[PDB]
């Protein structure tokens, strides 16, 4: 045809059926789904709703505070960046012989959010007691309505596939107890949460309120001066995020001791090196807080690296990786016609009104 | 040294919000500073008085300076065309930074942008010519009226522009 | 009659045609248009010549000059203004925007601000997300099934 750049892949017309994805056991073939989702291939609208609901039902039966046992590979924000997720599974290990703990934010920012849901949920069905998924602050409607996940679901599939995701995201667990030493949340602490019994008796399955214990778990951040506390006070208001609180070092270095915890493993914040270890708790010599970011070259602009965090044999291994190539999309998933017409409408009028300048 | 300063009295729908002082860098960028200062006084007929801020993205910038179309596609420079990228001496430090928008290399017009965060990815691609001297509280206020789209809910406008020293 | 303009409207544009005519042939060439200030810094100049050609010869004569600028009047309509806007994305006029034609028109506007591999990717997708019939190209039925709502037509107006 008239196709100029021929070497670039053409997205397959064929939408995968219930027979091609699933099996007679009900176990989905992840490797057949992977290579398709990488070529920008979509799924049959009903099998996309089947991967979500079957996987949502598996997350419902799971509790508020999951009890993860070592060895685990802890991941942070994946943020739509699917092509960077495929690389994460390579640095961290195959989902068969490796246990996983994702801290949240699979959706928004990156223009491949739905693929990150479909693969992780397909992995959740096949490996329920191995692959563990938590809840990040972007797994709510208000942040997907405002950001790019709603506009993704409308365009790639339907608004009903969005309502499938929204129902599944509420079934996602808030925290994780990794090897009786680590508390794993997305953001961090809450002043309304003193002990671990304050996380267990919470009404999940709802949309995160503007305040409250559920909000503070997914939204909280540490002070920018985490270590140098000239101005004390445990919990101050989070000016950077808008809602929620800020937690200082003595706010963490008291939650730990009060619950016999070693350190808190979070994500939420963008880290240049892909992680960040904060001030050591002078009881153990281990960092009181570690942030882990799994989205490299976040927004194709900050040239940040991404790291994964694997804990095996009483050793914490922080493995760093770089950005992998991905397909282009215009903002809000708009088509070239909607993007180019406002420019044509003026660059034709600024030509014709400038042809009447001579006389 | 003897650098020209200009102002912007922001108006939300019609009612005043406050002024923003802009120190221009005639020392680093001579032509580009004069292209802002000339439209800030309005000494060529067309100016920044009665202008719209079309794209406003939080944690990024405040794009404005489009009067021939107000949607983003228009605007014209004081050189009667669209000038060349002067130089990329000054970088995007962080908040307060005022830089030139463009349609690519050597396509500089009347459109600019005020930064609300560190924007180092735009270095060597956009010509920086000014910083906010006073009135950073007014810029942080304009910011919260935007979105991911860049769309302004309540139409933000500039209605009073001039010059100080 | 299917034309637009009247008496004093055609008479005023006849004074503007002799000034544009350097060689006074009666037909405006492309090398006659690109001598003006705000035209050498406009990507779609060659387009508002190839479409303004009812015969196709490189020169925009006085019949085509009155009929072309006629769609840019306050007396123009919806089905008409988007028809001309459709003919921008179509360089050969076969009434069907092919895969690589869209690429060429966009590069005229975007250029090197998007990498070669990037523009083709969004083109292959704009077609898959709008070509309902599956012909591999976009007609005026499908183009309107997308943009006929943003209403850019209310701004495609100049004065007589």
């Amino acid at each position: 045809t008239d196709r100029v750049v021929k070497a670039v892949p053409f997205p397959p017309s064929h939408r995968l059926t219930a027979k091609e994805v699933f099996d007679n056991d009900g176990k989905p073939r992840v490797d057949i789904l992977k290579a398709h989702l990488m070529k920008e291939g979509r799924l049959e609208e009903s099998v996309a709703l089947r991967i979500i609901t079957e996987g949502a039902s598996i997350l419902r039966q799971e509790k508020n505070l999951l009890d993860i046992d070592a060895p685990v590979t802890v991941c942070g924000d994946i943020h739509g960046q699917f092509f960077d997720l495929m690389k994460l599974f390579e640095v961290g290990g195959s989902p068969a012989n490796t246990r996983y703990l994702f801290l949240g934010d699979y959706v928004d920012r990156g223009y491949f959010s739905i693929e990150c849901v479909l693969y992780l949920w397909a992995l959740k069905i096949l490996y329920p007691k191995t692959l563990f998924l938590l809840r990040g602050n972007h797994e709510c409607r208000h942040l997907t309505e405002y950001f790019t996940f709603k506009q993704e679901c409308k365009i790639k599939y339907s608004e009903r596939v969005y309502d499938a995701c929204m129902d599944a995201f509420d079934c996602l667990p808030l925290a994780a107890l990794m090897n009786q030493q680590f508390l794993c949340v997305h953001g961090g602490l809450s002043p309304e949460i003193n002990t671990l019994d304050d996380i267990r008796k919470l009404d999940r399955f709802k949309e995160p309120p503007a305040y409250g214990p559920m909000c503070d778990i997914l939204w909280s951040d540490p002070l920018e001066d985490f270590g140098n506390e000239k101005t004390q006070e445990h919990f101050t208001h989070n000016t950077v995020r808008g809602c929620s609180y800020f937690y200082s070092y003595p706010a963490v270095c008291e939650f730990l001791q009060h619950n016999n915890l070693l350190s808190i493993l979070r994500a939420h914040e963008a880290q240049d090196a892909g992680y960040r270890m904060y001030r050591k708790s002078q009881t153990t010599g281990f960092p009181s807080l570690i942030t882990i970011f799994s989205a490299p070259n976040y927004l194709d602009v900050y040239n940040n690296k991404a790291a994964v965090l694997k804990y095996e044999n009483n050793v914490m291994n922080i493995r760093q990786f770089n950005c992998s190539p991905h397909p282009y999309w215009l903002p809000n998933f708009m088509d070239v016609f909607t993007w180019s017409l406002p420019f044509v409408g003026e660059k034709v009028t600024e030509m014709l009104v400038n042809v009447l300048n001579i006389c | 040294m003897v650098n020209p300063t200009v102002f912007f009295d922001i108006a939300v729908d019609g009612e005043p919000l406050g002024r923003v002082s802009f120190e221009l860098f005639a020392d680093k960028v001579p032509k580009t500073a004069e292209n802002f200062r000339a439209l800030s006084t309005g000494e060529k007929g067309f100016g920044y008085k009665g202008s719209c801020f079309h794209r406003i993205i939080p944690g990024f910038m405040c794009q404005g300076g489009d009067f021939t179309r107000h949607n983003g596609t228009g605007g014209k420079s004081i050189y009667g065309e669209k000038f060349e990228d002067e130089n990329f001496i000054l970088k995007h430090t962080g908040p307060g930074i005022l830089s030139m928008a463009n349609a690519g290399p050597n396509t500089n017009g009347s459109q600019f942008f005020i930064c609300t965060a560190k924007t180092e990815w735009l270095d060597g691609k956009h010509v920086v010519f000014g910083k906010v001297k006073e009135g950073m509280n007014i810029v942080e206020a304009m910011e919260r009226f935007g979105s991911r789209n860049g769309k302004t809910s309540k139409k933000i406008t500039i209605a009073d522009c001039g010059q100080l020293e | 009659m299917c034309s637009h303009f009247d008496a004093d409207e055609i008479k005023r544009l006849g004074k503007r045609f002799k000034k544009l005519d350097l060689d006074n042939s009666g037909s405006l060439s492309v090398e006659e248009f690109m001598s003006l200030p705000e035209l050498q810094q406009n990507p779609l100049v060659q387009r508002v010549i190839d479409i303004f050609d009812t015969d196709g010869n490189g020169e925009v004569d006085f019949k085509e000059f009155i009929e072309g600028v006629s769609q840019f009047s306050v007396k123009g309509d919806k089905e008409q203004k988007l028809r001309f806007a459709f003919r921008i994305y179509d360089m050969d006029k076969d009434g069907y925007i092919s895969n690589g034609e869209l690429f060429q028109v966009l590069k005229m506007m975007v250029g090197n601000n998007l990498k070669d591999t990037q523009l083709q990717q969004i083109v292959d997708k704009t077609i898959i997300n709008a070509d309902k019939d599956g012909d591999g190209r976009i007609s005026f039925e499908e183009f309107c099934a997308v943009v006929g709502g943003l209403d850019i037509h209310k701004k495609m107006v100049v004065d007589v």
Binding site: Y111, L299, D300, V301, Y328, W329, L330, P331, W339, S340, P342, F343, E346, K347 | R55, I57, F60, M61, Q63, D66, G72, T73, G75, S99, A101, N102, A103, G104, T107, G109, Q111, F113, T119, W121, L122, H126, G150 | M109, V110, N113, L114
Partner: peptide, 11 residues
């Protein structure tokens, strides 16, 4: 992404 153009706004 995060760009400031005049006419064709990119990713």
């Amino acid at each position: 992404x995060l760009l400031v153009t005049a006419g064709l706004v990119l990713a």
